[PDB]
Scaffold this active site. Structure first.
Site, PDB file in Angstrom:
ATOM      1  N   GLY A 116      -1.118  -9.094  -0.298  1.00  0.00           N
ATOM      2  CA  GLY A 116      -0.021  -8.232  -0.133  1.00  0.00           C
ATOM      3  C   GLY A 116       1.164  -8.739   0.639  1.00  0.00           C
ATOM      4  N   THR A 117       2.171  -7.865   0.730  1.00  0.00           N
ATOM      5  CA  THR A 117       3.346  -8.144   1.476  1.00  0.00           C
ATOM      6  C   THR A 117       3.142  -7.713   2.923  1.00  0.00           C
ATOM      7  OG1 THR A 117       4.481  -6.030   0.775  1.00  0.00           O
ATOM      8  CG2 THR A 117       4.798  -7.877  -0.564  1.00  0.00           C
ATOM      9  N   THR A 118       4.079  -8.003   3.820  1.00  0.00           N
ATOM     10  CA  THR A 118       3.996  -7.692   5.220  1.00  0.00           C
ATOM     11  C   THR A 118       4.616  -6.314   5.410  1.00  0.00           C
ATOM     12  OG1 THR A 118       4.169 -10.030   5.586  1.00  0.00           O
ATOM     13  CG2 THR A 118       4.013  -8.573   7.485  1.00  0.00           C
ATOM     14  N   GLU A 175       8.771  -4.840   3.605  1.00  0.00           N
ATOM     15  CA  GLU A 175       9.196  -5.847   2.779  1.00  0.00           C
ATOM     16  C   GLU A 175       8.801  -5.473   1.395  1.00  0.00           C
ATOM     17  OE1 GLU A 175       7.596 -10.237   2.306  1.00  0.00           O
ATOM     18  OE2 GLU A 175       9.395 -10.109   3.560  1.00  0.00           O
ATOM     19  N   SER A 211      -0.274  -1.924   2.160  1.00  0.00           N
ATOM     20  CA  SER A 211      -0.155  -3.261   1.607  1.00  0.00           C
ATOM     21  C   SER A 211      -1.463  -3.578   0.987  1.00  0.00           C
ATOM     22  CB  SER A 211       0.244  -4.426   2.643  1.00  0.00           C
ATOM     23  OG  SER A 211       1.502  -4.136   3.203  1.00  0.00           O
TER      24      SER A 211
END
Lengths: 196, 241, 111, 249, 226, 244, 204, 245, 231
Positions: H31-33, H48, H76
């Site tokens: 995943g993204t942060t 993000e 996320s």
């Protein structure tokens, strides 16, 4: 039968009789119509006797768990629990509860629930069936924000009239006082207000 | 073929899977020490805060079940919230149908059965947690009942848990062997907490701060946890020892 | 007690022409001696060249008309944009009526 | 949820069910327990063991009362004994007591506990119980009676028997000490004495649990004034009582 | 049916009649009416005769369960809260009006329960058809703080008020006296009023008076083998 | 997954053969002998227990003779635990038939019913079969005495004399050799003990390993009386046939 | 009308010393019309005798119900059921069908084999166990039976005093009642020997 | 001994660890942060959101969905599965609001979702969650903030992160409570929520992104969960560009 | 190993392999290209027949009078979802008088796909739909994965050789949005787009199927002689 609750400066004072008639024969005369459903939120029962008690046990089960998982309930919370049992079995469970209680953040509050199950906030409540004789007395001589001494006489004096004009109201006058100082029971025997 | 992956008996008559639950109650690495006073029961636990960002208040391992019964949990925190939840639900349920507050004796038996039932169906995973239940009963005196992943329980004078618990058990053992009585004698509960902290400072080989402790006490008819400010006060009374 | 059906009156007249059709009805909407509204249709278009009126008691009228305009939609969807006949509309309407026969509809329906 | 609906008790290729045999293995790991049926009682004895000496064994029950006439004692798993004592109590009352107004005969209750064993070999998702029980009892029609219920799901009536880790030694000692006539005081004198050649820890009344289903008591009944009812024939002996009789071996 | 339940300083005493009726006709001159949930929780029942006997037998069942599942004495409240709950579901189609009494470790108790689930507490309650009469005598002689030897007399004269003046009530008077941490004593047939006179003659008959049409012997025995 | 852990007890092998059924009959050979001999005046049922001991009570053990109903008994071979479940189902099934038609259940009907329950588990549900085999001794007005063996697969075939359980081969062949149709119960008793003397897995044919029962037409009033013998009457009859 | 007075029926039962006797009429009516003068209302499971009054069909249903339950008792515990134990099963079967019940009124009569005591008991519709050591009467001539039976009866009778009392008790209510009579059978139940004696009596 | 311990998840490996649940943590790493700053005033979420191509539509897709009217839930890992955990608490909260007539506490909610994610680790018939959520809000017990691992474990926090840039985010929040020892208002804290996402886009400097910021604060929105937008947002972006140069 | 035939089991590399395999169902399906503007959205689909005597497979499915879905995966799996979208479109109209929003209809869709990827014996749907529709927010084009992930795009494509269409659209992205009120051209820019996915498959009056949605046009599917003015 007459039940009431009045808000005052330090919290809320609850009030009840103790005669429960069925027919012409008084089954019990020392009935304790004032029930603890938490530890700072007490209620008043009137109407169909088994059907009010049954509901109260379930509300007690709801709040004991509510405390244990989510934190302490409020007057508001407890009344809501009550409503939704009367409302969803509103053809067969016939209940008038006055839920009164002392919060440490909003002080005393009173709710009145009649037989359909609709909550209504009030600065004093009266429900029952002996409270149709004292309706005009309770409104004229009541004041919002009374000191303690005054409050205890206001509820005594009303029930004294209820006793007089309603024969389904009688015996001891029970009062439970809910305040920040705590939980204090007072008891007034008949000579003590039949004197007046 | 498979028997270490479900909950059927091995050739030896043992349940390997049930044996792994006892090696999964130590992953927290938290030590607890629980002693019975005269009229009070005390449980002290370690509490660690791994980072800055985490707030210690929420980090807990002492969960309040009834209003008189607390439960101190060693082993993983998912199996702890589920075990807290069920135990709490039951406690309410008992009040409802028999009209008094739950005996600890019975909640220890009650949860023992449910624990067992998870080793007795193949799908259901058993819960890898040792629960220590502390109370002051009104018929059965101060008691400690400890459940464990098999669905066994037994009473205790005192008990300890965690991985480093061997050290702790022996210290406890000496005190009652020497004395020849089954419970600590002293009426003030403040001092049963004091005795407890010393026995943990000696056993684990460490002194403590208020944040390294989280202390729960059951007196009569109520359970509370002490705040961290109040816990410092308990620590000064060890210099008076 | 409860009483579960009323009447909201009005009248319809469907006249089948020889190469045309006409479906008329008054739009007067009443309850008891009250006039609810001067104008409020009782003839609804359903599209695909079928008009429909259910006149009688309003609440059923709205729902059975409504459940017909979906049976129109679903017909176009799964029989793939075939023409829906008046003749096939009728048979269909009969099951909608008959589906409730123990707490029944209350409208005379003319298409 | 569930998504198991097939047994995990299965036959082996040379015959014999694999699972009911394994379950019987877990029993002979456990404690040593015995039951001796006399002409006027049944005495049962078992040995009490704990995690640690800080664990009490006075708040743990390795002898249970199912009804006021029929008691239980086990060798095997503690946890399995717990659930199987409770389900027996529940079925003792619900599948006979309500209907017939009295508590079940000893035979009749034994028969019922044997079907519970059976449904943990049969039915998906379950494994067998890992206890062998002695169920000693008294009914009006079989006199005093001793049975041994096993994980197999079959029961056998005995004259005296042993189960546990010392079972083979115990029964060789019991062969020579069972007599046709045994008095209740003599029966206790054999049962403590057998269990003593199967103890290697402490020997005290706080570590040896003994219970008689002797003859009846109108002092643990809780009332007087109905002469129909005669109290519990079951009577578990506290630690002190058992201890006097250890000094009298 | 007159059933008193009178609390006193060291316990509770609950006494009842021995008359069981079926319509206006007296089924049984003597029958039990005090039944036993638990050895320390007695009860007597008024209202519908079958539904007294079965509901006592049934919450009797579950308490005996429950007392042994908890390894402790079964409390008066334990019984009370199950009765209550059970009766409310059928919404007052099960006719029972029980005086529930008992001692337990947490003191002396005394309750009454209606067929739906009202419950009341006094130090003296009565249910039955006799209720009215019973209750009158109690309020005159009764005070707070009665001894045992006092209590039993108050219970007896109270049921006797029941017998004279109520017709659903009669025959002998049963008592059961419970004191806290002493055995519960059942004194069935404590006080006998209305002892039946000698009949004016015997109405026995010589042999052969009635006429038989035929006789046989019919078998209750199993089939045998010689 | 749960699909992994499935045994598959209800599949055909490549031969066309049911693993769990072949194994069920295999395991019933560990369990003690059971014999039935059908006379033309009764049936003798005689069975040798699968276990004996010197501390065991041998006088109320029932693991071989069990009454399903008044006029129909079984001899048991298999595990007794398995048999106990089906035995309370049969007792019910019999008792129902009496209830609705007010006549006692035919032997044919009660035996086909037991086979159908057994078949069911090998047919559907993924549950083990019960490893039990019964010889039924039973009477009805319809054909008089009937003797029958059913197997864990769920099929029944009539017999004149039959054996299930331990040393099956040995007992059945011997039975053919001594069979006559002129036997009466006196003779039928004698041959049933004599065949058990040859299959015996112990020192001698002793009373304390025998359960023994009969259903006799010599019993009084022209009606079958089922007599399940006590071990004190087995000990008496063991002297009569002269073995001891 | 009444669901328990539409074919009538009566059962009387008495104790004596060392003996009991029970007896029923043989009338099955459909209202006014007599259909049969040979339908039993007494049955016997073992040495217990269960007389069943009330609606016609539920006499029969209930006979095959207890026929089922008595078989399973005997088979498991390897004896004939005792009178006292059985009475509890008669109560529970009625109570299971608490609403819309069996419109009967049975009578249990035996002599216990384990104590040698006469023992009798009764039931209403819903079934409340009615102890006695006198006699229990049930049915549609039960108002008459309760008066008549008490008057002749002397506490304890000999085995054949008992035949003369319970026979007269039954006759005289049954010929003052319209839905009872019409031939009757009286049983004398001693320790081990039961005689079934039909009675000569008024058919009109 | 044996073979497996990764085919089912109501097995326990011998060490005392799980599988599958142990493996599900690697799934959340893909995943993204996404960050949460717990402010004194409330909480400020930021995420993000990757922009792959210009084919997609900017400011039209979201990883911040509301639960109740006063709780951000932002997640996320595997995005449909993370949306199922958000879906679940919309149901849960609506029932609570029906039952007890009050806005559902954050501590109540924290217990509720926790039990469910735990619940899937106790059967082999369902898959363990392979997402982590960071949720919090403002109720009447003050501002609270939580992170819930797919392990079924959750704790209190005053700063959280998860996804690829959880090393730089965890460390830069350490710096953020150590700049400000008496804390900071939510209005300023919008600007730090932008800065540390841009610093956690140096773990994703093969990609380009659009920044979503949202807040629930007692006194900036009256305790109600809204989106930060317009003129206030464009200022947070400018601060963050300067900070990474 | 057995991580690949179980939809309930991870995967030491942090995946599930089944959703991935299910994502390969889209690659072996046929090609379709969607492009949208602010007033009109368009689907331009390449139908694909099996042999000479076989018919051509319809690849634009009418979901409503203002909503359409087009498959590019496997056809049998698409028949379960098509109903589902219709069902929630009629429920939204019926109860709330609302022509079901396109964006919200995506969110329903997610959770139907997810709940079978969580559950054993279940499977992710192998189909991946491109869903157009015209509500009050304007025109929209959604791409639905077998994952259950929905994304909102100016124009995209899925199927076989989809990457070349994405390129034609990545370039011509800033041309077609500023086309508004001219459906004629919007249809023309997608014909050129799907022509880059061919490999001598050509476009005829039996191969091409276009369907459009407007602010002044309902849902319409053109086929036969109606797409022959847009070759």
């Amino acid at each position: 039968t007459s039940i009431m609750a009045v808000t005052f400066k330090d919290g809320v004072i609850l009030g009840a009789d103790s005669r429960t008639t069925t027919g012409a024969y008084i089954a019990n005369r020392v009935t304790d119509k004032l029930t603890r459903v938490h530890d700072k939120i007490w209620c008043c029962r009137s109407g169909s006797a088994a059907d009010t008690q049954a509901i109260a046990d379930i509300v007690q089960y709801h709040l004991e768990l509510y405390t244990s998982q989510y934190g302490t309930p409020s007057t508001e919370t407890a009344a809501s629990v009550f409503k939704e049992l009367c409302y969803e079995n509103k053809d067969n469970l016939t209940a008038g509860i006055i839920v009164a209680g002392y919060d440490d953040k909003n002080k005393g509050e009173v709710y009145t629930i009649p037989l359909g199950g609709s909550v209504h906030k009030l600065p004093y409540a009266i429900a029952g069936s002996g409270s149709t004789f004292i309706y005009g007395y309770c409104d004229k001589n009541f004041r919002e924000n009374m000191s303690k001494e005054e409050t205890v006489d206001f509820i005594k004096h009303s029930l004294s009239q209820a006793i007089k004009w309603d024969g389904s109201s009688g015996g001891v006058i029970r009062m439970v006082v809910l305040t920040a100082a705590g939980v204090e029971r007072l008891i007034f025997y008949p000579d003590e207000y039949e004197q007046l | 073929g498979y028997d270490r992956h479900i909950t059927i008996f091995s050739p030896e008559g043992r349940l390997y899977q049930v044996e792994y639950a006892f090696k999964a109650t130590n992953q927290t690495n938290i030590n607890s020490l629980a002693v019975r006073g005269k009229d009070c029961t005390v449980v002290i636990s370690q509490k660690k805060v791994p980072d800055k960002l985490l707030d210690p208040t929420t980090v807990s391992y002492i969960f309040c079940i009834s209003r008189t019964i607390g439960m101190v949990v060693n082993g993983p925190i998912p199996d702890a919230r589920n075990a807290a939840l069920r135990a709490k639900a039951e406690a309410a349920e008992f009040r409802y149908k028999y009209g008094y507050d739950m005996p600890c004796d019975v909640l220890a038996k009650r949860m023992a059965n449910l624990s067992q039932i998870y080793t007795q169906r193949a799908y259901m995973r058993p819960l890898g947690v040792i629960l220590t239940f502390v109370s002051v009963d009104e018929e059965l005196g101060p008691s400690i009942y400890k459940t464990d992943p098999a669905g066994y329980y037994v009473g205790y004078k005192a008990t300890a848990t965690g991985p480093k618990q061997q050290e702790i058990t022996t210290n406890l053992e000496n005190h009652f062997k020497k004395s020849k009585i089954d419970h600590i004698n002293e009426e003030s509960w403040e001092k049963v907490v004091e005795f407890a902290i010393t026995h943990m400072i000696d056993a684990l080989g460490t002194e403590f701060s208020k944040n390294d402790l989280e202390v729960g006490v059951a007196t009569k008819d109520k359970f509370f946890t002490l705040s961290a400010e109040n816990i410092e006060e308990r620590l000064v009374a060890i210099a008076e020892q | 007690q409860f009483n579960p059906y009323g009447d909201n009156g009005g009248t319809i007249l469907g006249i089948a022409g020889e190469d045309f059709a006409v479906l008329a009805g008054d739009t007067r909407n009443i309850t008891d001696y009250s006039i609810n509204s001067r104008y409020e249709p009782k003839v609804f278009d359903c599209g695909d060249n079928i008009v429909m009126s259910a006149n009688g008691f309003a609440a059923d009228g709205d729902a059975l008309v409504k459940r017909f305009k979906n049976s129109v939609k679903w017909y176009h969807f799964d029989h793939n944009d075939k023409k829906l006949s008046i003749n096939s509309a009728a048979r269909n309407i009969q099951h909608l009526l008959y589906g409730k026969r123990f707490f029944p509809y209350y409208v005379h329906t003319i298409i | 949820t569930d998504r198991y609906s097939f047994s995990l008790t299965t036959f082996s290729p040379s015959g014999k069910l694999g699972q009911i045999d394994y379950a019987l293995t877990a029993v002979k790991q456990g404690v040593t327990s015995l039951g001796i049926k006399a002409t006027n009682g049944v005495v049962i004895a078992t040995e009490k063991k704990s995690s640690s000496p800080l664990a009490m064994s006075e708040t743990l029950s390795k002898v249970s009362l199912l009804t006021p006439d029929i008691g239980a004692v086990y060798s095997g798993m503690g946890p399995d004994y717990r659930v199987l004592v409770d389900k027996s109590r529940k079925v003792a009352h619900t599948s006979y007591k309500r209907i017939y107004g009295e508590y079940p005969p000893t035979k009749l209750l034994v028969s019922e506990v044997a079907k519970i064993m059976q449904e943990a070999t049969q039915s998906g998702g379950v494994r067998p119980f890992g206890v062998s029980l002695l169920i000693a009892g008294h009914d009006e029609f079989n006199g005093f009676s001793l049975y041994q219920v096993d994980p197999s799901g079959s029961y056998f009536p005995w004259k005296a028997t042993a189960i546990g880790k010392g079972s083979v030694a115990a029964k060789t000692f019991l062969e020579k000490r069972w007599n046709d006539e045994l008095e209740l005081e003599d029966a206790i004198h054999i049962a403590l004495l057998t269990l003593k050649e199967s103890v290697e820890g402490e020997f005290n009344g706080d570590t040896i649990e003994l219970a008689i289903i002797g003859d009846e008591n109108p002092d643990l009944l809780g009332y007087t004034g109905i002469p129909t009812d005669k109290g519990p024939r079951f009577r578990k002996l506290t630690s002190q009582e058992i201890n006097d009789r250890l000094e009298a071996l | 049916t007159t059933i008193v339940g009178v609390k006193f300083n060291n316990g509770v005493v609950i006494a009842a009649d021995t008359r069981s009726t079926q319509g206006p006709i007296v089924a049984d001159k003597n029958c039990a009416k005090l039944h036993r949930i638990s050895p320390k929780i007695w009860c007597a029942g008024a209202g519908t005769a079958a539904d007294t006997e079965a509901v006592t037998q049934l919450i009797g069942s579950n308490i005996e369960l429950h007392s042994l599942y908890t390894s402790r004495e079964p409390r008066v409240v334990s019984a009370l809260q199950m009765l209550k709950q059970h009766l409310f579901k059928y919404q007052g189609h099960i006719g029972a009006y029980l005086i529930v009494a008992g001692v337990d470790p947490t003191g002396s108790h005394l309750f009454s329960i209606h067929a739906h689930g009202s419950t009341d507490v006094g130090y003296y309650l009565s249910l039955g058809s006799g209720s009215l009469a019973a209750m009158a005598v109690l309020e005159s002689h009764w005070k707070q703080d009665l001894t045992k030897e006092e209590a039993i007399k108050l219970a007896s004269d109270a049921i006797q008020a029941g017998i004279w003046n109520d017709l659903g009530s009669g025959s002998n008077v049963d008592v059961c006296v419970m004191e806290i941490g002493k055995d519960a004593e059942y004194l069935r047939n404590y006080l006998t009023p209305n002892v039946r006179e000698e009949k004016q003659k015997s109405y026995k008959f010589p042999r052969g008076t009635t006429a038989v049409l035929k006789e046989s012997i019919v078998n209750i025995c199993d089939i045998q083998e010689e | 997954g749960s699909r992994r852990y499935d045994s598959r007890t209800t599949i055909f092998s490549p031969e066309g053969r049911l693993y769990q059924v072949e194994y069920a009959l295999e395991s019933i050979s560990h369990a003690g002998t059971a014999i039935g001999i059908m006379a033309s005046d009764g049936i003798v049922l005689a069975a040798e227990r699968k276990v004996t001991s010197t501390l065991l009570e041998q006088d109320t053990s029932t693991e071989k003779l069990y009454k399903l109903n008044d006029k129909i008994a079984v001899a048991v071979a298999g595990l007794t635990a398995d048999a106990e479940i089906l035995i309370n189902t049969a007792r019910i099934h019999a008792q129902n038939y009496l209830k609705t038609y007010n006549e006692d259940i035919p032997v044919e009907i009660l035996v086909r019913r037991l086979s159908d329950i057994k078949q069911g588990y090998t047919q559907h549900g993924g549950l083990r079969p019960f490893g039990v085999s019964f010889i039924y001794a039973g009477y009805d007005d319809r054909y008089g005495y009937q003797l029958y063996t059913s197997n864990p697969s769920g099929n029944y075939t009539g017999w004149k004399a039959i054996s299930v359980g331990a040393n099956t081969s040995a007992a059945q062949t011997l039975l053919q050799m001594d069979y006559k149709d002129d036997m009466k119960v006196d003779d039928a008793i004698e041959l049933a003990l004599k065949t058990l003397s040859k299959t015996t897995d112990s020192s001698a044919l002793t009373y304390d390993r025998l359960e023994f029962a009969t259903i006799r037409k010599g019993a009084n009033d022209g009606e079958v009386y089922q007599k399940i013998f006590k071990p004190q009457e087995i000990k008496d009859i063991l002297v009569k046939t002269g073995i001891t | 009308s009444d669901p328990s007075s539409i074919n009538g029926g009566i059962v009387v039962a008495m104790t004596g010393k060392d003996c009991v006797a029970i007896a029923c009429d043989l009338r099955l009516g459909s209202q006014s019309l007599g259909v049969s003068n040979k339908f039993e209302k007494i049955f016997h499971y073992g040495h217990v005798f269960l007389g069943i009054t009330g609606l016609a069909t539920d006499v029969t249903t209930l006979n095959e119900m207890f026929r089922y339950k008595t078989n399973l008792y005997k088979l498991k515990e390897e004896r004939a059921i005792e009178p006292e134990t059985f009475t509890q099963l008669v109560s529970s079967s009625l109570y299971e069908r608490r609403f819309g019940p069996y419109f009967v009124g049975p009578v249990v009569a035996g002599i216990n084999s384990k104590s040698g005591k006469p023992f009798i008991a009764g039931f209403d519709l819903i079934g409340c166990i009615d102890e006695a050591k006198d006699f229990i009467v049930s049915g549609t001539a039960s108002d008459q039976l309760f008066g008549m039976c008490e008057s002749l009866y002397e506490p304890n009778l000999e085995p054949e005093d008992l035949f003369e009392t319970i026979s007269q008790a039954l006759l005289n209510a049954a010929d003052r009642d319209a839905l009872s009579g019409w031939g009757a059978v009286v049983y004398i139940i001693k320790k081990d020997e039961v005689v079934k004696r039909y009675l000569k009596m008024r058919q009109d | 001994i044996g073979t497996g311990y990764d085919l089912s998840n109501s097995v326990f490996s011998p060490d005392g660890r799980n599988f599958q649940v142990e493996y599900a943590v690697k799934a959340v790493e893909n995943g993204t942060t996404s960050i949460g700053i717990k402010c004194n005033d409330g909480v400020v979420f930021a995420v993000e959101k990757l922009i792959t191509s210009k084919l997609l539509v900017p400011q039209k897709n979201v990883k911040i969905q509301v639960v109740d009217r006063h709780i951000g839930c932002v997640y996320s890992g595997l995005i449909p599965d993370g949306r199922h955990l958000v879906n679940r608490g919309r149901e849960e909260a609506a029932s609570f609001k029906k039952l007890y007539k009050t806005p559902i506490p954050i501590p109540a909610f924290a217990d509720r979702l926790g039990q469910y994610v735990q619940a899937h680790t106790l059967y082999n018939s369902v898959r363990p969650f392979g997402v982590s959520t960071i949720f919090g809000g403002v109720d009447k017990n003050g501002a609270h903030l939580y992170m819930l691992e797919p392990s079924g474990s959750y704790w209190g926090y005053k700063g959280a992160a998860t996804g690829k840039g959880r090393q730089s985010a965890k460390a830069e929040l350490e710096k953020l409570v150590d700049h400000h020892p008496e804390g900071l208002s939510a209005r300023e804290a919008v600007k730090q929520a932008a800065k540390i996402i841009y610093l956690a886009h140096e773990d994703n400097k093969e990609k380009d992104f659009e920044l979503e910021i949202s807040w629930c604060s007692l006194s900036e929105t009256n305790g109600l969960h809204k989106f930060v937008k317009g003129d206030l947002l464009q200022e947070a972006i400018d601060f963050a560009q300067k900070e990474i140069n | 190993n057995n991580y690949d035939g179980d939809t309930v089991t991870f995967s030491p590399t942090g995946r599930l392999f089944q959703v991935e395999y299910a994502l390969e169902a889209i690659k072996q399906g046929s090609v379709t290209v969607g492009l949208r503007s602010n007033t009109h959205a368009v689907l331009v689909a390449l139908k694909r027949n099996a042999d000479e005597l076989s018919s051509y497979q319809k690849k634009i499915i009418k979901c409503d009078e203002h909503m359409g879905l087009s498959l590019a995966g496997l056809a049998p799996d698409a028949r379960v979802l098509s109903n589902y979208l219709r069902q929630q479109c009629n429920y939204s109209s019926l109860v709330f008088n609302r022509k079901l929003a396109v964006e919200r209809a995506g969110h329903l869709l997610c959770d139907k796909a997810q709940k079978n990827t969580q559950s054993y014996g279940g499977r992710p749907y192998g189909v991946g739909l491109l869903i157009i529709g015209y509500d009050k927010s304007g025109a929209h084009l959604l791409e639905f994965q077998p994952s259950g992930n929905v994304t909102e795009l100016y124009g995209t494509a899925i199927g076989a050789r989809s990457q070349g269409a994405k390129t034609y659209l990545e370039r011509t992205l800033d041309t077609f949005i500023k086309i508004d009120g001219n459906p004629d051209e919007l249809i023309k820019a997608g014909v050129e787009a799907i022509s880059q996915s061919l490999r001598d498959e050509s476009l005829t009056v039996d191969n091409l199927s276009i369907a459009i949605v407007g602010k002044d046009t309902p849902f319409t599917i053109y086929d036969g002689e109606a797409v022959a003015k847009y070759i």
